[PDB]
Design a protein around this ligand. Structure first.
Ligand SMILES: O=C(O)c1cnn(-c2ncc(OCc3cccc(OC(F)(F)F)c3)cn2)c1
Ligand SMILES: [Mn+2]
Length: 326
């Protein structure tokens, strides 16, 4: 580009994995004393979690490790910003990817394959995808770009849909509220969410989520599949951002003034052998889940679709409290 955020976004978009092009990116999943990079790594600080605020039972029920096993970080100069590397129990990411791909995209919610009205939804998305695999044209699941849950934009009023509120998925609600509680938002309520589905060449340009405090509540950002490069900038659009990786299962929480910062995803990184899954996903969802659990079993035919999809995709979930938002 021409200004410093656009320069870095283009840099990272055109960057070569596996070379020193990325030695400037923070990896919160690396074991260091905030070194090795220059300016980025030096900003990394521990952030304290409200460990007593999420019981063991409730973490487990959510598919999470016990909050006391979590690590969490901020960045000097970015108030309200918390980064938590994958706190999910092994296998449990598969549940949330399944829900995003198969259930949440189901028609009561709104997706990009129409604006807000309905197009003729011929041939259920999931069961086509199931039989695109069995038999050797662009999949209906491969075309999905975003999905709104809870609150849905109308695009003419430029505000949320009048008479179309859909109930917020209570498993994703429980998970979000456990994380938000441990970040010290024990009253948080999940009410509006967006699911973003990226291919390996998909990007997200420089943007802010909202422009107003006085109604701003915390926003949580989940990630699954391939890693992305995340750029976190400032209130004005040409302040140079800080680059960081989002690996499968990482969670970012934005509150306070962080909620207003310009951010971006310039790059979804391919698996280093071009097609394949991150290591944390090499664990399957247990066969026997706890009876009191908010997660449900996953079927082989469902897993196969997810496993094939994610080889070249990143799934993003953002969840926020409402009581809006370019
Ligand atoms: O993948 C990541 O890491 C990432 C980081 N940010 N991000 C992101 N941020 C904002 C955002 O705005 C959604 C938005 C706003 C208003 C109305 C909307 O309704 C409609 F459905 F679009 F019509 C939607 C989407 N995605 C994703
Ligand atoms: Mn955003």
């Amino acid at each position: 580009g021409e200004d410093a955020f656009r320069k870095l976004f283009r840099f990272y978009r055109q960057s070569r994995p596996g070379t020193a092009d990325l030695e400037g990116v923070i990896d919160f999943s690396a074991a260091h004393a905030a070194r090795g990079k220059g300016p980025g790594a030096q900003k990394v600080i521990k952030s304290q979690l409200n460990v007593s605020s999420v019981s063991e039972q409730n973490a487990y029920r959510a598919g999470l490790q016990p909050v006391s096993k979590w690590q969490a970080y901020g960045l000097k100069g970015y108030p309200g910003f918390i980064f938590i590397p994958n706190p999910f129990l092994p296998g449990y990411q598969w549940h949330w990817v399944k829900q995003c791909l198969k259930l949440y995209s189901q028609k009561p919610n709104v997706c990009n394959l129409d604006k807000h009205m309905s197009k003729e939804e011929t041939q259920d998305l999931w069961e086509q995808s199931k039989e695109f695999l069995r038999y050797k044209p662009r999949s209906l699941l491969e075309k999905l770009r975003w999905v709104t849950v809870g609150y849905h934009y109308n695009w003419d009023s430029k505000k949320y849909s009048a008479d179309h509120y859909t109930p917020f998925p209570s498993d994703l609600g429980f998970l979000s509220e456990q994380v938000a509680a441990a970040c010290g938002f024990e009253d948080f309520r999940a009410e509006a969410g967006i699911l973003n589905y990226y291919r390996l060449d998909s990007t997200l340009g420089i943007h802010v989520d909202r422009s107003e405090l006085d109604h701003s509540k915390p926003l949580l950002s989940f990630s699954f599949g391939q890693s992305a490069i995340f750029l976190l900038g400032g209130l004005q659009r040409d302040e140079a951002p800080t680059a960081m990786f989002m690996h499968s299962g990482d969670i970012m929480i934005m509150s306070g003034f962080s909620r207003l910062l310009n951010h971006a995803v310039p790059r979804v990184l391919p698996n280093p052998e071009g097609e394949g899954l991150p290591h944390c996903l090499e664990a399957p969802l247990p066969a026997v889940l706890p009876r009191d659990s908010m997660v449900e079993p996953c079927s082989m035919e469902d897993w196969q679709v997810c496993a094939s999809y994610l080889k070249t995709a990143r799934v993003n979930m953002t969840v926020r409290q409402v009581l809006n938002f370019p």
